[PDB]
Design a protein around this ligand. Structure first.
Ligand SMILES: NC(=O)c1ccc[n+]([C@@H]2O[C@H](COP(=O)([O-])OP(=O)(O)OC[C@H]3O[C@@H](n4cnc5c(N)ncnc54)[C@H](O)[C@@H]3O)[C@@H](O)[C@H]2O)c1
Ligand SMILES: NC(=O)c1ccc[n+]([C@@H]2O[C@H](COP(=O)([O-])OP(=O)(O)OC[C@H]3O[C@@H](n4cnc5c(N)ncnc54)[C@H](O)[C@@H]3O)[C@@H](O)[C@H]2O)c1
Lengths: 320, 480, 124
């Protein structure tokens, strides 16, 4: 009767685990082997995936034909009548038409994530689910959603390779009728201030606040060429106070520590300094140099690791 | 080999009978601890305990203990719940994952809502991590429900192992999810939560798996804009440049051929960070497979020709050094970087370009015809078919794909007067192949407004009419 | 052919061990002068010292002395800076240039800003 090849098509094109498990059990209780589920990224196929796709659907005669010609997944999506007839030894047009039916079934169930920029396969699928075979043919010509209104019928015939004129008319009709300086600077300590600074940057960029990070990237000998351009452009300032944050800022009477440079630059600018305390006691005013003693008079915010959302909202209520 | 199996089967029989028989409050957790300790003893055997641990997981599955663990995950007590979760974490093999996809989905998903204790979350993150590796249907059922939100909330923690489990969970979900799964991750900003996971200087594996997840999300062309707006691609290349693959190859015992096929389209997706991640991982795992004797897997899958394309078309020193080290640790030679001045090529550079990309059969064909770089840029269908003995159109089409890749990365300084290649590149980066075809006709920026379609077809040799229409439209609307 | 290699390897081993061990203000520059004088003796051999100088640059690279020179280029003293620069000038072979492109970019670029003394600039 021929239910075995239909079960092989169920296994090789499965989007459900139950029918695939039942088809694998049905092919296991019979006398033949079970096939494998194919990799959907067909433009990412090498030669072995093409050979496996040949072995699973019933083209075992033409396995040596594609291997000598070195046909990968990029050449399988772009194969025509003449290359099947002359170069591949597939002289019969009925065998070629069965191969194009299997190619239609393959190019329906395919992942085009490596080349589709504007999600053209879902545009083709919203009209008719058999239109998704020309996704590679329209993407490989350089098209997207913003360029289909200037495409003609000859460009779909010759370049995109759409042989049916009804599909060309429907694609043209549907293409014509419905288509047409950071703000928050964060200084942190190298030892235990990286994760809290990155977490503050993520929770501020969830609300659209542009945040500059990587002070340590500018610690490669660049003295003041980019720190001034970062802080002068920064609308606000966040001082991550790790446990032991201002230890290296004590007795630094030569302006060598980078966190001390950030504090002196922020006090020279006069920006809104918002300290973030993560288990850190307030240091003495007299042990710090006189160019940074004003940081102890700003309204700091204590950090809670299990109640972070209200703390981030309190930070957002204390910014511009 | 089979002695550890005969030592470990009846002990787990007695332990699973004790778990099935006793239903107390503290002896059940003690039995779970005994089974989990025997699992720890099973996985820690050098080159023995892999098949032993797979057989013991098969013995747990065939006894019915997986349904017992699914019952104990719904227990109201916390201690037996965390021991049942930590026992279920270490037994998720490819035969158990089918059973968990059949029944166990929805029970672990119920534990994904309880997020406050750390001892649940450290194991449930690993359970979801290994359950993202099953299929695309399980990825859709976890992302559409509250399975992705649990990982994206647990990325806020400071646990140096739970963040590893979350990084591997997002990486496996990006590898095995699909189009709609990547859309529901990135539209819910899953790439932004990897930023503390890509920067944390406490662990080195954690940043690597975070940048792996970032690169696999960045291999999708409909996604790359929000990933560049996330800012996590800037931390990939200094991380790969600052580390050495030999130490991370000695630290890790490799991955199978199914997972090796996931690292290959990282190199052919024309993004710098994804190519660096793929070259680093294939170099480390090529060192692993060169310690063993199974280096024929890369020739069966085909990553060697992609590494040769990385070396022969390198614009970065780090990915080129990693690809040269990966090809050196294998059994073949490394290629040389080509000279970009293709109109300045003589015959020997053309022969070298043939030898580096896989046209060793046609090396004697171009030498007798005296094809230099000027004739290589101006080669067509008929000269390949008749004069060069390349009768097959599929071989000609592979040669034109390699010619497209060559004429994309080419120096035209000897003939381009008005910088036409940057004019072609500003529209579409695949338009730079016709730079020689438009310059060789005598054109520049001040003459494209009087060019017709027939002049682009016959003289410039543009075979695609869509590209002809776009070039004519851009020549008419913005030049003059 | 290989006699100059066997004469020049343990002397550079002792000299790079003296550069790695001593961290003074004037003996380090004397060790840099000894290494640079042996480099001058290495490049001035008729049709012999090419592969010999390449092997000695490989021996300097595999010992870790290139990172030592990159550390001494960030020294606050001027004399050890100019001897480290003049030593780094004569050892830039195609295998060393990969290491300098990996790490050494940005340290030499920092010396590109200091332009007034001639003894730095002639070597940089
Ligand atoms: N030390 C540990 O605690 C430990 C170690 C490993 C696994 N586990 C547990 O095991 C479960 C996951 O294991 P898995 O089996 O599903 O892994 P997996 O299938 O997801 O990863 C592939 C593994 O299979 C191996 N492999 C498969 N085919 C191979 C081949 N042809 N040649 C060489 N190697 C091949 C690879 O080496 C690789 O380790 C999890 O529960 C995990 O916690 C624990
Ligand atoms: N007298 C000196 O002080 C002296 C002389 C030479 C080099 N150096 C130093 O060496 C470094 C640069 O040397 P380099 O090796 O990088 O030079 P290079 O590679 O930039 O220049 C090419 C050199 O390699 C030789 N060469 C390479 N392949 C050859 C081949 N197949 N056949 C014949 N000759 C071949 C050439 O003769 C030529 O001298 C610098 O630091 C420079 O100061 C110093």
């Amino acid at each position: 009767i021929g239910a075995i090849q239909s079960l092989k098509r169920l296994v090789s094109y499965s989007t459900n685990g139950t029918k695939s498990a039942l088809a694998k059990r049905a092919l296991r209780l019979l006398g033949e082997e079970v096939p494998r589920p194919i990799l959907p990224s067909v433009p990412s196929w090498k030669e072995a995936e093409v050979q496996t796709w040949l072995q699973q659907i019933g083209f075992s005669k033409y396995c040596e034909s594609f291997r000598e010609q070195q046909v990968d997944g990029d050449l399988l999506l772009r194969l025509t009548e003449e290359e099947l007839q002359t170069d591949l030894g597939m002289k019969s047009g009925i065998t070629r038409k069965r191969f194009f039916r299997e190619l239609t079934e393959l190019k329906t169930f395919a992942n085009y994530s490596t080349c589709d920029r504007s999600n053209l396969a879902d545009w083709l699928g919203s009209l008719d689910p058999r239109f998704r075979q020309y996704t590679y043919g329209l993407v490989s010509c350089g098209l997207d959603r913003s360029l289909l209104h200037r495409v003609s019928e000859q460009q779909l015939l010759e370049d995109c390779g759409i042989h049916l004129g009804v599909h060309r008319a429907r694609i043209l009709t549907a293409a014509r009728e419905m288509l047409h300086t950071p703000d928050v600077f964060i200084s942190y300590r190298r030892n235990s201030g990286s994760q809290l600074a990155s977490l503050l940057k993520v929770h501020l960029q969830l609300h659209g606040f542009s945040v500059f990070i990587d002070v340590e990237k500018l610690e490669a000998g660049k003295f003041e060429d980019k720190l001034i351009q970062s802080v002068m452009g920064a609308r606000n300032f966040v001082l991550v106070l790790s446990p032991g944050a201002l230890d290296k800022c004590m007795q630094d009477h030569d302006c060598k520590d980078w966190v001390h440079k950030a504090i002196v630059t922020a006090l020279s600018c006069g920006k809104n300094i918002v300290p973030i305390i993560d288990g850190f006691e307030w240091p003495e005013p007299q042990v710090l140099p006189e160019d940074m003693q004003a940081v102890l008079t700003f309204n700091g915010i204590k950090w809670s690791h299990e109640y972070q959302e209200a703390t981030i909202e309190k930070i957002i209520r204390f910014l511009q | 080999v089979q002695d550890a199996l005969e030592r470990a089967l009846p002990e787990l029989q007695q332990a699973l009978s004790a778990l099935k028989q006793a239903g107390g409050a503290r002896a059940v957790g003690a039995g779970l601890a005994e089974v989990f300790q025997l699992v720890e003893e099973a996985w820690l055997l050098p080159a023995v305990g892999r098949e032993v641990a797979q057989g013991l997981c098969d013995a747990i599955r065939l006894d019915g203990g997986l349904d017992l663990l699914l019952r104990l995950l719904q227990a109201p007590e916390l201690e037996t719940r965390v021991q049942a979760a930590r026992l279920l974490e270490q037994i998720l093999v490819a035969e158990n994952r089918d059973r968990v996809a059949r029944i166990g989905l929805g029970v672990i998903l119920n534990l994904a809502k309880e997020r406050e204790p750390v001892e649940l979350a450290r194991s449930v993150a690993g359970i979801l991590e290994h359950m993202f590796k099953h299929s695309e249907e399980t990825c859709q059922r976890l992302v559409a429900a509250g399975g992705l939100d649990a990982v994206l909330y647990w990325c806020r923690r400071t646990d140096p192992a739970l963040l590893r489990h979350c990084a591997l969970a997002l990486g496996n979900c990006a590898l095995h999810g699909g189009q709609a799964v990547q859309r529901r991750m990135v539209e819910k900003r899953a790439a932004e939560w990897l930023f503390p996971l890509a920067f944390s200087k406490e662990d080195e594996l954690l940043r690597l798996h975070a940048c792996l997840a970032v690169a696999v999300l960045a291999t999708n062309k409909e996604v790359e804009r929000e990933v560049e707006r996330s800012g996590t691609l800037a931390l990939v290349e200094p991380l790969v440049a600052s580390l050495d693959p030999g130490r991370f190859a000695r630290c890790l015992q490799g991955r199978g051929p199914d997972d090796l096929q996931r690292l290959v389209p990282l190199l052919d997706s024309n993004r710098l960070e994804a190519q660096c991640i793929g070259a680093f991982y294939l170099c480390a795992e090529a060192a692993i497979k060169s310690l063993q004797g199974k280096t024929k897997v890369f020739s069966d899958i085909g990553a060697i020709q992609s590494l040769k394309r990385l070396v022969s078309y390198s614009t970065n020193g780090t990915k080129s050094a990693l690809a040269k080290r990966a090809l050196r640790l294998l059994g073949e030679e490394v290629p040389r970087p080509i000279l970009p001045s293709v109109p300045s090529w003589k015959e020997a550079e053309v022969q070298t370009w043939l030898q580096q990309i896989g046209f060793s059969k046609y090396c004697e064909s171009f030498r007798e015809q005296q094809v230099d770089g000027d004739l290589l840029l101006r080669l067509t269908e008929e000269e390949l078919q008749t004069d060069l003995g390349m009768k097959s159109g599929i071989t000609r089409k592979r040669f034109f794909r390699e010619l497209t890749e060559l004429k994309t990365f080419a120096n035209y300084s000897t003939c381009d007067r008005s910088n036409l290649a940057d004019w072609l590149g500003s529209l579409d980066p695949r338009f730079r192949q016709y730079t020689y075809g438009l310059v060789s006709c005598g054109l520049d920026r001040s003459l494209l407004h009087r060019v017709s379609e027939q002049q682009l077809l016959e003289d410039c040799g543009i075979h695609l009419g869509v590209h002809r229409a776009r070039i004519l439209t851009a020549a008419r609307e913005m030049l003059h």
